[PDB]
Amino acid sequence: SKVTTVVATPGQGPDRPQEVSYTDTKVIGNGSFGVVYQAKLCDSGELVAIKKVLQDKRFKNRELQIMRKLDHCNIVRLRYFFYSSGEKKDEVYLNLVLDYVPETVYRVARHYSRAKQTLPVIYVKLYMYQLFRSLAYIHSFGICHRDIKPQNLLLDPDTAVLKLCDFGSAKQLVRGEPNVSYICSRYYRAPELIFGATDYTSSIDVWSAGCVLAELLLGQPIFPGDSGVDQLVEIIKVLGTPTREQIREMNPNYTEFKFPQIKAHPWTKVFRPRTPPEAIALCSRLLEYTPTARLTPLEACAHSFFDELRDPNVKLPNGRDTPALFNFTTQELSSNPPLATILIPPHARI
Numbered sequence: 001s002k003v004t005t006v007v008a009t010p011g012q013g014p015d016r017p018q019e020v021s022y023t024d025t026k027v028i029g030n031g032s033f034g035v036v037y038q039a040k041l042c043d044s045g046e047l048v049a050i051k052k053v054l055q056d057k058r059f060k061n062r063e064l065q066i067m068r069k070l071d072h073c074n075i076v077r078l079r080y081f082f083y084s085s086g087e088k089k090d091e092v093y094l095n096l097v098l099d100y101v102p103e104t105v106y107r108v109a110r111h112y113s114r115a116k117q118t119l120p121v122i123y124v125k126l127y128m129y130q131l132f133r134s135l136a137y138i139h140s141f142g143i144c145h146r147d148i149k150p151q152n153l154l155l156d157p158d159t160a161v162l163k164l165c166d167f168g169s170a171k172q173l174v175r176g177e178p179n180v181s182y183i184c185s186r187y188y189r190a191p192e193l194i195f196g197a198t199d200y201t202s203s204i205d206v207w208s209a210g211c212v213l214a215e216l217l218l219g220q221p222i223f224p225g226d227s228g229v230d231q232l233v234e235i236i237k238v239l240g241t242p243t244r245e246q247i248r249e250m251n252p253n254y255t256e257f258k259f260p261q262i263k264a265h266p267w268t269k270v271f272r273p274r275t276p277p278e279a280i281a282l283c284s285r286l287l288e289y290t291p292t293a294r295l296t297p298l299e300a301c302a303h304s305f306f307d308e309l310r311d312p313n314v315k316l317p318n319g320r321d322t323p324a325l326f327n328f329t330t331q332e333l334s335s336n337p338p339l340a341t342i343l344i345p346p347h348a349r350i
């Protein structure tokens with residue numbers, strides 16, 4: 001039970017460093033950036049994660065910049081950040097200390113799928129709405145996550161609160177400056193990115209969210225490509241070959257083979273017989289080739305598949321109340337404020 005103490009700036013708040021003490025630190029993850037840890041704050045005993053990434057001096061970290069300006073019930077909070085050096089030579093690490101949320105949609109969905117069960121539709125509605133809520137929030141800032149996938153959706157199994165995490169691929173999408181095409185995890189990678197587009201939009205996140213919805217409905221990934229290019233083949237096996245005009249809207253500069261001519265597969269045959277009609281309906285307005293065709297995250301939240309969540313009597317399966325789903329801020333409703341009439345049901349207004 002060793003106690004580590006660091007001088008950390010508060011996450012959102014003002015640049016006033018304070019000493020923060022934590023203990024009980026375990027490795028829990030890693031990647032190309034560095035290592036991820038769990039720890040307990042000696043103060044409040046609250047659990048936290050710490051993403052530790054090698055940060056080159058003299059050049060700013062865009063994940064930190066993006067995270068300092070986010071504050072949303074469905075996004076993991078950046079509580080503190082701090083620097084530290086070691087294990088290496090004259091290298092500086094940036095540490096993000098984030099709220100710890102214990103579960104992920106990936107692990108949940110794997111447990112049902114291993115037990116050959118479908119995750120109940122109520123959980124599908126709860127997870128997907130909160131994911132769409134977080135997207136509406138970051139997209140109103142022009143920030144695009146670029147890594148929506150089941151492992152980056154944290155869950156509290158008791159409150160069913162969902163929080164979006166891992167902002168190591170997020171970027172301010174600025175109009176006219178290009179962006180890299182090979183982002184997003186393969187299975188959740190939108191088609192314009194596979195077509196090499198570099199002027200894509202936030203709707204690549206909405207494609208990803210549709211892949212997750214579809215995956216929850218089906219109990220397995222809906223487009224499991226065994227490469228960056230075979231991903232497109234899997235997509236085509238459901239949506240059929242994209243029309244010449246659809247290829248233009250995805251990226252207006254391309255010749256990728258020509259693909260064999262394949263008919264679109266009807267959405268009803270894509271899912272299992274007892275799949276709810278509004279789930280399939282919602283899904284088909286997300287998994288569209290034309291990136292302007294897809295729903296915005298707010299419109300998705302307004303979808304009728306989510307109406308059970310707007311019911312005043314709804315409860316979680318463990319008898320408890322649903323998390324807070326109607327406290328929209330004006331920034332959240334900014335893209336389409338009229339949608340408030342559907343999104344804040346009567347029983348939830350003041």
Ligand SMILES: COc1ccccc1NC(=O)c1nc(-c2ccc(S(=O)(=O)N3CCN(C)CC3)cc2)cnc1N
Pocket residue numbers: 028029030036048049051076098099100101102103104107154165166167168
């Ligand atoms: C790999 O993680 C990242 C990579 C990049 C950026 C951010 C993150 N993570 C987070 O930000 C974050 N992660 C978690 C989190 C939750 C569950 C898991 S677990 O795999 O289910 N598993 C690991 C082993 N353990 C013994 C049990 C549970 C892993 C991690 C919680 N709260 C967070 N804030």
Ligand SMILES: [Cl-]
Pocket residue numbers: 071072073327328329
């Ligand atoms: Cl909020």
